[PDB]
Amino acid sequence: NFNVAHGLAWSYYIGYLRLILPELQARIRTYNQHYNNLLRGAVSQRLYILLPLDCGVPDNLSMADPNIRFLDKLPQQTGDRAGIKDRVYSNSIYELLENGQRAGTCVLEYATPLQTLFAMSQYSQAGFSREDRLEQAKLFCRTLEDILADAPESQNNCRLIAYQESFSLSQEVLRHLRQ
Amino acid sequence: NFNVAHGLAWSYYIGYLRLILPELQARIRTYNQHYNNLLRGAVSQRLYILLPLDCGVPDNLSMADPNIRFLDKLPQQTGDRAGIKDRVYSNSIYELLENGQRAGTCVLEYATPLQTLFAMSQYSQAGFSREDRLEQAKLFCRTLEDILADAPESQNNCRLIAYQESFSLSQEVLRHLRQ
Numbered sequence A, B: 001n002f003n004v005a006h007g008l009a010w011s012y013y014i015g016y017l018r019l020i021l022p023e024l025q026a027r028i029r030t031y032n033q034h035y036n037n038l039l040r041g042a043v044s045q046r047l048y049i050l051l052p053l054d055c056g057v058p059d060n061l062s063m064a065d066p067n068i069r070f071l072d073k074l075p076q077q078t079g080d081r082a083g084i085k086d087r088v089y090s091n092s093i094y095e096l097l098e099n100g101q102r103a104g105t106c107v108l109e110y111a112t113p114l115q116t117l118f119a120m121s122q123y124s125q126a127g128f129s130r131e132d133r134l135e136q137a138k139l140f141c142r143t144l145e146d147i148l149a150d151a152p153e154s155q156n157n158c159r160l161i162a163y164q165e166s167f168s169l170s171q172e173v174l175r176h177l178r179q
């Protein structure tokens, strides 16, 4: 079963991180210079990737924590991909609240393949148990860490936030953001 | 190694086909009614998915065959996905030429995971041989066929075009399109 998370981690790098991480600093610089509110803090460098090991991935982050609120989108990145003209890669900027006030602003999202591991564990024909899922989530993160450790597109460009669940997601992101 | 193509096929269904196939007929109907040139044929129903078993997936289809030409995009499908506000799913309409004249119009693309299998075979750290790749491409298609055969979102909504390479890609699509 090893090969499920191995494949998904390689697919996440090849099909997403290696394509968007090289251009991310320029998109954030563009946002900060031309789109960011004049009075607010600069959007932090780096893509922050949430890796819940229970593979609980809501689509709406902005509601999953009261202290994480959607602010804005980066400029879109588009390119021809496998016969799709101008396929769109979009990223969302979030404010992180601490004591009701803004403590940080960053590009934040879940690793969408963890949502796949979760769905595969639920489908009879995938032949993937809820025990397989925790082991595969750990292997997914370890494989991604190992890829990015040798990856030339990763130039201080992303931070992996792995966690297991009271737990505060905003505090967990702020701890990485403040390093 | 089985588990690489198994995972990618499940991920392609869960993360893409099960999300876009339910809404595809409505997007094509919208295109035909409101956006299609009044004088041209209706865009055919169904998403046509190219599955080259050599995993050769160019990003620009429109140049990879002189007889396949980009025409237009469908209306975009957007939704919140894993913390991405309004992630964009886009599909491209192609004309198929026969004897220099239009013989068909359809929504056409490559299965992007086959591009992943190809890249994994090229990266030393993926531990995936060019022999592994042909076997995994076949298993990817077989797994996807088996998923879609039980899939309620597939309501005569897509056609898998698997092929191995002189070979005419346009003729291969027209044969499926005319059935």
Ligand SMILES: Nc1nc2c(ncn2[C@@H]2O[C@@H]3CO[P@@](=O)(S)O[C@H]4C[C@H](Oc5ccncn5)C[C@@H]4CO[P@@](=O)(S)O[C@@H]2[C@@H]3O)c(=O)[nH]1
Residues within 6 Å of the ligand: A008, A011, A012, A013, A014, A015, A016, A084, A087, A088, A089, A090, A109, A110, A112, A113, A116, B011, B012, B014, B015, B016, B017, B082, B084, B088, B089, B090, B112, B113, B114, B115, B116
């Ligand atoms: N956050 C984030 N993740 C992304 C994004 N793009 C890819 N990924 C992840 O990178 C890996 C490799 O991607 P591929 O394009 S070879 O495979 C995709 C192909 C198909 O999707 C689409 C979508 C739009 N148009 C055509 N096809 C389902 C399959 C898995 O799709 P997922 O979005 S569940 O996860 C993928 C996958 O894990 C993105 O824009 N944002």
